[PDB]
């Protein structure tokens, strides 16, 4: 859906990784890039402040800044929701997708067909996927409430 929106009226959508990756090219030795590397080598996977900065930096991006951006599945924790509000990264509107596990698994079986459409190895564990989805429920309930 995010991609469909982005295409259909040239809108943006962002994952956190999108910004971080962009930063890597835009200057591999920027402050944020240096911190990112340092943390990565410490195994510190994305201390949230880094993503928060990268995201508001992405708001600079003229298309989004003037026109439109959407964010997918983020924040993933209430703590991120709080710190985003602290900067006041604040969507005008939010939408939520309620789905039976059966549907998710059927879609995943079609993704299994796509894996033959693909060729290079990829992470496909329905077991992990289920775990992640359950924790998505866990955090999203609180995030929605707030």
């Amino acid at each position: 859906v995010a991609k469909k929106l982005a295409s259909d009226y040239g809108l943006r959508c962002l994952s956190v990784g999108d910004a971080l990756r962009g930063m890597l090219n835009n200057h591999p030795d920027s402050e944020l890039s240096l911190m990112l590397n340092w943390h990565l080598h410490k195994g510190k996977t994305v201390p949230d402040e880094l993503a928060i900065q990268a995201l508001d930096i992405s708001l600079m991006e003229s298309v989004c800044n003037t026109i439109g951006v959407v964010i997918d599945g983020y924040p993933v924790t209430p703590h991120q929701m709080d710190l985003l509000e602290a900067r006041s990264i604040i969507p005008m509107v939010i939408f939520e997708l309620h789905v039976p596990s059966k549907e998710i698994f059927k879609r995943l079986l079609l993704e299994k067909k796509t894996e033959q459409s693909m060729s290079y190895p990829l992470h496909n564990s329905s077991q992990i996927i289920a775990y992640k989805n359950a924790k998505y429920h866990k955090n999203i309930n609180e995030i929605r409430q707030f």
Binding site: S15, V16, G17, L20, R21, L24, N37, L40, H41, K42, G43, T45, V46, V76, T77, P121, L122, H123, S125, Q127, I128, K132, K135, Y136
Partner: protein
Amino acid sequence: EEWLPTPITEAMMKEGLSLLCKIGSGLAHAYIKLEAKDRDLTDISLLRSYIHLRYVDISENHITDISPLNSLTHLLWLKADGNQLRSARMNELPYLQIASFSYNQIIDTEGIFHPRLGSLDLKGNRIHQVTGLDPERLSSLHTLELRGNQLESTKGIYLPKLKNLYLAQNLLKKVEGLENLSNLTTLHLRDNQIETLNGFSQEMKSLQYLNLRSNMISDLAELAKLRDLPKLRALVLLDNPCADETDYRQEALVQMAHLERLDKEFYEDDDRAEAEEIRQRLKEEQDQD
């Protein structure tokens, strides 16, 4: 043998660690590749700090053990060919989709158990025999490559999950026993030695293609036997003694019309129209019974 101790440091991680992706929790993000193929490496103790990879190559190194990786099964693939390892004695990995350990010091099949590996390669290893090969717990293992290996008994390779196996150039004075592995789809005995069947039948029903290059085969009566396979459509007998037989490829086309390919060579399809007459001749011989 002569090497300096070669653990690793931040500097190597800064070069190697690459491809940024959102971790097994689906929350934060991590770099997913490591690359230290050949740096005379020996130790992985720093690598433990980066459990989140999916991909590594560290082949052609002096690494003797990786057992800390047993903590890190979220990896999808590892190559560590040429390294100093002796068997796959890891935990039964829930995610290592593929690996290879060819040219290693590996001897056997210990620890080969992983539910979520599909393909493995082990050519040029010192492997001699089956040492445990679980038919079920290897629940995804579809492919194994073993060219040149020092191999021995090939019964007990009882792994229905496997599609195809490649013991080409392996030192097998004889091979044995495949009939129950219905999912068996291809074997190479390319450059092997053997002269007669060893427990093979149509019950390997998925088996579409077999290579027997340089094997001892001579008696085309074998063409009566594994003809029974429902889906075998290709063979190789190249450089076998049967290549001296006056029909050989011709007779093989008679014995199996859907033998589409032989000896690096797709068949003369109009010689199938010939071999249909020759099959009539055979039936006129055979239906005298």
